[PDB]
Every structure is written in C-alpha cells, then in structure tokens.
Design a protein around this ligand. Sequence first.
Ligand SMILES: N[C@@H](CCC(=O)N[C@@H](CS)C(=O)NCC(=O)O)C(=O)O
Ligand SMILES: N[C@@H](CCC(=O)N[C@@H](CS)C(=O)NCC(=O)O)C(=O)O
Lengths: 214, 214
Amino acid sequence: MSPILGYWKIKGLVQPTRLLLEYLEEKYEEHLYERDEGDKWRNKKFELGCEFPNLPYYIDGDVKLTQSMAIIRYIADKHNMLGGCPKERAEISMLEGAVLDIRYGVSRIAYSKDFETLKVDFLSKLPEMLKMFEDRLCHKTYLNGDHVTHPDFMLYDALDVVLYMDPMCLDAFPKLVCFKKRIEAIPQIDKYLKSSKYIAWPLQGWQATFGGGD
Amino acid sequence: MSPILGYWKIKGLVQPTRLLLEYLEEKYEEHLYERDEGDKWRNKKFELGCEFPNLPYYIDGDVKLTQSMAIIRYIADKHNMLGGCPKERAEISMLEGAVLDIRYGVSRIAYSKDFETLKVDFLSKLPEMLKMFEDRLCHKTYLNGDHVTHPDFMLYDALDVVLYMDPMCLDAFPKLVCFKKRIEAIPQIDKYLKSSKYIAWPLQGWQATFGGGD
Ligand SMILES: N[C@@H](CCC(=O)N[C@@H](CS)C(=O)NCC(=O)O)C(=O)O
Ligand SMILES: N[C@@H](CCC(=O)N[C@@H](CS)C(=O)NCC(=O)O)C(=O)O
C-alpha cells in the first residue's frame, strides 16, 4: 500500500534518501522515532522482519532493507538510476564514496568529547575534498553530467552540514555554491524544503556535540 | 595490458578486493606504497588521471577509479556478481554495509589516543553485530546463498581483524568460525594466503595504535 522509511526524526544518515524520494515523487510514509522514543524503537527493532535490524530501515512489501546506502541505491535502482554499464555504475559509486568521506568525516567526530579540536583537523582537509567536486562541476551540471543521480542529494546533504560547521567553507568554491542552490531550485526539492515534512534539525543524534540538541 | 590496484602495502581498505580478484583469477599488478614512501604517493597522486585522487585506486584502461567500495563492486560488476534485480542488488549492498559496520568500527577507533578504552565499547557491541551474520549463515552457505559474492570476502576480512582485537570473539559463533575456514578453503584463496603476494600485516596504517607496526 505504501513503502515505509524508518529512522530517528533527524537528518542524519537518511536525509539524502528523503530528498531522492521527493525528487522522484515516490509515495512513502515515515516511522520517525523522536528523541524520547528509544524504547519504542527497541520494541520494533526485531519485529519488522529485518535480517540486519538497524535504523534507517525501508519496508517496501518487496524488501525489508536496513543499511542507509543500500536503501538509497535501491530506490534509485527502482528508477533505473544506478548506471548502465559497470563503468557508469562505478563512476556513481565513486561519487558516493567521495561524498561520504565528507559526511562521515563529520559524523565520525560528532558526539566525541574532542569534537572542538577534531573539527579543526577535519576543516583543514575539507578544502582538498571540496576541490575535487568543484573541479568535477567545472564541465558537468550535476555530479554525473546533465542528469541528477542520487550522489547529488548526498553532496547536497554534505554541503548543508559542513556549512553549519563553517559558514565560510564554500567561499572560494563558486561552483559548489551554485550547485547547492541548483538542487534547492529543483521544483520537487524546493517544495519539500518549504514543507511540513522537512526536518531542519538536528543534523546528528540529539546527543551529539555537533549538530545535536533540539 | 593489465589493470593496476594501488594502495599502501597493508591490508586496510583493500584486502577484500585483493581476495575477490584472486577468487576470480583476474590478472592484476599492484602499486604497493611502503611506509617510507609517502613522498612517492604524493608525486603520483595527481598524475594518474583520477578525478577523485585517493588510495586505493584501480586503473583498468577502462576506468581511473578510486573509492575502495566502488572498486570492489566494479570488479564484481565485471563478472556480473552485483545482483540480478533491484532486490538482490539491495540485498548485497545491505550485507556490504553490515560488514562495514564492523570493519569501520575498528578503523574508526584505530590510531585514536583512546583506542584502548574505545576498544572495550566496540567489543561490547560486536556480539550483536556478529549475531546477525551467524543467523544469516544458519540457512545459507555464504552470505547471499549458495554462491560467493564480494561481501563474503568483506566479512572474511572483518573476522580476520576482530580476531586480533579479541581472539575469543568468535567463540559462541560456530557458523562464523566455519565460514572463516570455508573462505580459506576456497582453492584460489588457500593458494593466495600461502603465497608471496599475501600481506599479513599491518591491518591498518603502520602508525595505528591497533593493527599498526611492522
Ligand atoms: N551503517 C548503518 C548504520 C546505522 C546506524 O548506525 N544507525 C543508528 C543511527 S545513525 C541507529 O541508532 N542504530 C540503531 C540500532 O543500532 O539499534 C547505516 O548506514 O544505516
Ligand atoms: N573512502 C575512501 C578513503 C580512502 C582513504 O582514506 N585512503 C587512505 C588510506 S586508508 C589514503 O592514505 N588516502 C591518501 C590521500 O588521501 O592522499 C575509500 O574507501 O577508498
């Protein structure tokens, strides 16, 4: 009747998936566990039929999927966006990993006691990572060319987050600044960000030192 | 003439890829950067034609690929092992992510100053992660059934590593113990592990607190 995307009521690992779903105008319902509902999750964790119980999870009546990256790729796969041949498929997975180096680079330091200092190390190397995408966008509208692929929403999510860590990290990366605005300009995305469904905060778990809180 | 797999001369991110290549009897050469060859890497980093320069990298004359997960999937993709339909494809990516939770769980704490204490937290939750694979192997020979898929070598690599962190972590997981021995029993793998090509140590960068050193 309608696929279900379950996760904490935060951006975290699943925000890019939500954006991809909105871009595709796919119908879905959400199981959003609030910060005071850890017990609620534990009572459902093992009764969903998931072989590798975790959050996020995506139940499609066709699959009981868990890992965030498998979920985003599945939805894109349903719409035939994963590639066309091994080379394009690898190209897209390479973009995936590259964006993850940034997004995980943030999550990895979030919630540690040393976040304030680890943040300076991450930000010192952020430019080198960002530069690769800036170059990539030199002759391509989106990461994989003229057409949107899931890594575009992944990059979008990563940019949204690092801007919170350093509001100036994109100064000097005009292509990236344009890209972020282009994604927001996509009718479906524009509508979603301005909707009741948009979860603007937190970036990480509420308990995180960075991107946490209400 | 022959694809190239470049990485540090350590197991790290690329060991499962090496195993997949050996299983498939694929021909390849390796660019193995020794611990005192950081300068050598920096002099090659930007002259390989890679759009997202990094280690590992895989040059096939067909592609200039970098991200470790994109590389392993590409090689499997060349041999038509990624799936068959979106559901099987997602099944395999879910297994990927699940193994990564263990492998990255280790790399994430390796090299931190607090590794000794972080190690106890990781190991306390390791059983719950391992149990999912133990259950999975209850009615399946390999992770995806009767046939080997790349996540099997990923799981193998993860098991090899956590056993160094805790030689007893698999006691109580007989299916996992059998699985590890089954992978080692694959003729191609048996031959590889006993060969000159096998890199037994280090597990992480030589400078890591865990799995480092010569
Ligand atoms: N590698 C997994 C990790 C998932 C994960 O760590 N989920 C966290 C939230 S970010 C959840 O709290 N896990 C719930 C649990 O372990 O029961 C993925 O990418 O989905
Ligand atoms: N997400 C990337 C990360 C790669 C990576 O961090 N490689 C390290 C070794 S584990 C290398 O030293 N990077 C070299 C560089 O950044 O120039 C992957 O999975 O390949």
